[PDB]
Amino acid sequence: YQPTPEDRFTFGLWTVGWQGRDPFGDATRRALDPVESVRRLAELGAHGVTFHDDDLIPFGSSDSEREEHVKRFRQALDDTGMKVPMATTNLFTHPVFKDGGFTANDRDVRRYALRKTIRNIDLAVELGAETYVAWGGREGAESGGAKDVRDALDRMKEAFDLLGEYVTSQGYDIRFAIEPKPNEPRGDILLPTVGHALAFIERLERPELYGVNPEVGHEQMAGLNFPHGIAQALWAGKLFHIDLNGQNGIKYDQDLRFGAGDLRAAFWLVDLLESAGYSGPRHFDFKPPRTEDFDGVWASAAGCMRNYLILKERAAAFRADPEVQEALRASRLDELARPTAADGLQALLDDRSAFEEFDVDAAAARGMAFERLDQLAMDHLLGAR
Amino acid sequence: YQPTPEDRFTFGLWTVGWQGRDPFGDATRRALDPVESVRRLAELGAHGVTFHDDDLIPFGSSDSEREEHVKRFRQALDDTGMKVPMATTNLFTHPVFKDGGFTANDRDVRRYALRKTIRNIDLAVELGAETYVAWGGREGAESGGAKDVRDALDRMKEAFDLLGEYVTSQGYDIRFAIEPKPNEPRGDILLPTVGHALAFIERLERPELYGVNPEVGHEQMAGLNFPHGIAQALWAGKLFHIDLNGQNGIKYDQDLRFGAGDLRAAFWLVDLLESAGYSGPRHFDFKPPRTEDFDGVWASAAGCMRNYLILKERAAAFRADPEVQEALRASRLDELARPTAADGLQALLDDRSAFEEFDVDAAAARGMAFERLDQLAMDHLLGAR
Amino acid sequence: YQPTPEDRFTFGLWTVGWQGRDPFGDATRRALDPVESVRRLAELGAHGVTFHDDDLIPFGSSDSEREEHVKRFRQALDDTGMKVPMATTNLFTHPVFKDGGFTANDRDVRRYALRKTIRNIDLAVELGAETYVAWGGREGAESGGAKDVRDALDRMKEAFDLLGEYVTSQGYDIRFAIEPKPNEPRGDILLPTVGHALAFIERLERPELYGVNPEVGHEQMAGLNFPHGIAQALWAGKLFHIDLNGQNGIKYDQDLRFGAGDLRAAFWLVDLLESAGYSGPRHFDFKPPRTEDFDGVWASAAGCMRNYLILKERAAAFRADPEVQEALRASRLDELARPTAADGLQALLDDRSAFEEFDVDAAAARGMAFERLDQLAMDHLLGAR
Amino acid sequence: YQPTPEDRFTFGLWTVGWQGRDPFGDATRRALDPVESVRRLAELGAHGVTFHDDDLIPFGSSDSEREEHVKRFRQALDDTGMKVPMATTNLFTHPVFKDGGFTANDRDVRRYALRKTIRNIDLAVELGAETYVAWGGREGAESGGAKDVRDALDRMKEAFDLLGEYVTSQGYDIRFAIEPKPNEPRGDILLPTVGHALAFIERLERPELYGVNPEVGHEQMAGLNFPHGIAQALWAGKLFHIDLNGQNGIKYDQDLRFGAGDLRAAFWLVDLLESAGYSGPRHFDFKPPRTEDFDGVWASAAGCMRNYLILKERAAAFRADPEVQEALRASRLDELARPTAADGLQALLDDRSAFEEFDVDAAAARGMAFERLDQLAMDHLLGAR
Ligand code: PRO
Ligand code: PRO
Ligand code: PRO
Ligand code: PRO
Ligand SMILES: [Mg+2]
Ligand SMILES: [Mg+2]
Ligand SMILES: [Mg+2]
Ligand SMILES: [Mg+2]
Ligand SMILES: [Mn+2]
Ligand SMILES: [Mn+2]
Ligand SMILES: [Mn+2]
């Protein structure tokens, strides 16, 4: 289960570089130079790295400082063969964004948020990024009167439409991916789930430029089924990027390494991504727990990739097993994939077998055989076949 | 706070008619004749009632029995002046729907589900319903291999497209409203939130025919902010109907009377519906707790309406209070409603006040004054002004 | 991974006998004769069965009917070698218990609840049960004024004290196990967690007679860590019995087969029970999903036992692996088991190495190595060593 | 609704002094001098303040610096008439406590945690504190193998027993209050609820010295009913202190001002504290949201007290209303307070009215009238009587 760059595993600078500060704790690790992170990740078999503007260039840097930060980072990529498939903007850390970036009540802040974003889009394109993520972590409210949500969505659409106009004007090939989260740091965050983000995209001027960047932990913070949400995103042709990690149910955003948290959901996620032929980066947005030293940081990062590869093997074995294939037919997964009424509306209305002469009791008596199918899945996952 | 039919309050037959059976309990009340429910609800000041096919006509009824059930119900409506603004299909109770209706793995069940629905659409139109609700409570899974979600969404779209073709073919004016729920009775239900339902509608052949019917308790079962979800539905022009009740957070679907559960969320919901000019029914999908006798049933129903009217008064007082209006300006809710960049992209790029000469520290130092605004809201709600 | 009676696996009659009725659904399976359940479970390698009074003897049975039900059940036990290690009372199904049994507001209902319980204690002893479970599923409230909780706890203590007096008076060896659940069917249930039950027991007249019967799904409905709660119960010497199943986080009580739901929590639970030498029944309180026919029922039951045995193997391998033993020392699990201050208070106060000369920075810099340890655990669980 | 010191409202230095740092955000406010906080709080009508050691004396202070910090604080108390009824230790911020204080795997850290605590107990006594709180926020784990919970509870008991021995040895009158929280910052925290803490106390050497300090938001993070937990604490005679705030269900610890979050739970809490005659401080552990400037900080603090006083008035009016008193009798709250079987076990066994001649159907048919009672409560809360 050794990863290589061909596996497309990527990591945010802010992941392995997390110093361990939490709402009740000071840092437990020294800051990492992005150059060292790129080197260590490459050694582990990563394909690339991602960044917020402010991860790569400290906020408030002069043009000369900016140039040097980028130069060193560029050299690290060149030294290792690492890529930068995605980048994003920090519109959440600085106190100016305390009520949001794109949907701040203050109009001057909204305009600044757009300019900060546009600056980093140019840099992302320079470094070769194909996807530009937007996580509106500060868009939302703690109280009901503070944020008129219809007005906020008007502002959010205005912002994304302007970004689309910008990339079009420059002839950039980059596309946007909106990252939903239901809460934290705001009491409620706007576009809280994959569904809300997908719906919002449909109202944009150029919807083809926008997809979703769902995160395992985020959908799980709403108690939702992450593989189901990913399936709906795939169904809509909008899974532009994905963030992999672990989460134990409904609580603060844990950002455990992938495989941790809900292990079976991780299995079903990998099964879906591989079956569907998802071809984007397998990106980890995780935090090595603050209990760890740097050796533990790299161990945790390695574990992300290892767990993906183990689950990949087991899911493939599951789908390829003739006994499982038989069980899938027994449970009528084949029938689920057949149209309900390709014969058309009038034919359905005229079909007595669909109502007048439908034996409901006989149909009801037919077991779904889902438990046997699921125990085959369990046996494959655990290597107990 | 006395309701009258002008207030548009409606109730499902299955609400006040709930006999009190739960997953661990037998019935605590006798069944109600729909005729008596219509009379008692009218006496309380309700505007109308809604029904599943199987609430009004016992499953398996002959044509003669069906005719008599409808005749008696029609007479009750005529005797009281009650309306029927919405109807729906029961695609969840009968064991044949154990794996779903529209997305059952068994194709014969999917076809039957469509025929059962179509039959009741005709009846709904006959009784004057303007909205036809679909709650896919059995669409989903307890285990990962049982349901391929992309295939299931293909089947779900096929079903809704056929229903749209049907209403179009008959020249009916009725529109559809999809009701999301995240779980229960299935381990995970497809289209689990308002966002997922909105997104799905965009992929239908005739999206203009479909909106959402969100329920307070359902979105709260995912820990989501219900007023926020309703705002996004309104923003999309898709709030075709709404179900009002109460829920205490993340647990089984409680169906408490409206006002119970999250009281402040109820306040903000009423504030939003009234401000936006929502003009549809104020429908209660609640269950008087099984502790209650029939006197308690009608008391609980009356309380639904009373709480709506109290909250309406307090929200209106809040919005009309000059002190609140001043606080809203102090918190820049006015600025939130102004376009970010009506001057356009190039103007924004050329505007030094948006970046090069933006004083981020001065902006950051400006308090939002949200706590004072929220305490004014609290004071209005509690009648402590 | 074939179970035999030596493994002490037991099942409730109401588990495999669940007909599939849920809050939105009619039965999907015919009722099972307890005699057939005993036979089928024995064939699968079960050790025994458990019952509520009303599972074994239909409510309202005459003395002659009662005698025959017991006679047939006795014969099934004798035919199979099955045991009955635990029994319990149904104080939740009948509408008389709509506000509770032991803590019903109506005093006559409380007295009846006690008499019903006492009758079944006699039967449980006759059939050889060593543990008598009490799940107060109806003890609680949907609204704040309905239940004064201090008064309710007074009544709950009165009830349990009387039961203790009863078993003492008869010279029975049977002990009680209180089963916590946080909610469902009541909006909030009294003694909602293992902790609350443990605390309550300390106020009983004869606390030695009472322990807990925790259920995996129940603690998980509060988002709690089930292995942690079981550890506290063991620490207190109060794990008299346990109910095993699966649950996907915070929602309605799913009662999935053991191993389903939170797989890693199942692993850590088995690790703890085996390490601690828990010697009681491994009891499954689960429901085969209503999608299943009878073949699926027995498959689901078999899966409960299979998953326990797989996890047992993997946990044992984990603890026995010299590499894991080294990692445990690296993470100072050995130090966690050593007293903090066996030298005593004055020695600690006088020890400059504990404060005045404690190098906090050096201590802080020492990584815990928890991620490497956890990936070894993951590798063992998945059979990827 | 103007608070005065007689109302016993207290605030932590770290509450109004929170600079607004969160897991995704830098500070939005400057640090407050404890002297200014004491003055501003007194002006608002507070009774007193509380502190962690490190809130009052910056970590690493020399003896001379320590003396001056205390001197200035003492002068502020004297200038205002403010009291210090409670103090606590910071065993969570410094990286040395990354795996805990009292239950750190490293024994040297456990010993240091005890010495740090003991030092501050002396200071707390000097400043007049009657209660010493312990919140073990770092006691717990993110992964299963990292923490053997039985061993950890052994260490936790050792620590609390030593603290008890210490206060006894000094003749101090101060008592301890253990503050539960289910998670955050650790993935799972030990003693996660009021119940677990109560149970743990019973195993201490001198249980009379220890009670609980429950927090509204903390119990709600497990989805539990806070008034119910407070009732069990009162029932056990262990409510030594309480922390008041607001929380919107199951998510990160929000620390909203009291009254925010679950408003009806706040009502029922105040009703219980006032009815029971809780005589300790009404302490607020809240954070003014980081959106706020200093004016908003004091507004938020004032709102805590205002909401307590409004709810106090409404709860008192509810209990005093003859119509409510009649409704309480109708719902048999009086019967709930009467012993079930003061006649004794044998009398109950011999009482045919308790079983043989108990009319279960007649009892079952009696409605509880809980909905009418609850709407009276709603009407009182909203000032709609
Ligand atoms: O390449 C991709 O990522 C998508 C997934 C479905 C087919 N194409
Ligand atoms: O009539 C309605 O319901 C919608 C609400 C927004 C404006 N029109
Ligand atoms: O036999 C049992 O179940 C308990 C477990 C710890 C040691 N004895
Ligand atoms: O004074 C107190 O706080 C406790 C409350 C119940 C009676 N005494
Ligand atoms: Mg992310
Ligand atoms: Mg509904
Ligand atoms: Mg159980
Ligand atoms: Mg606190
Ligand atoms: Mn995250
Ligand atoms: Mn509902
Ligand atoms: Mn259960």
Ligand SMILES: [Mn+2]
């Ligand atoms: Mn808190």
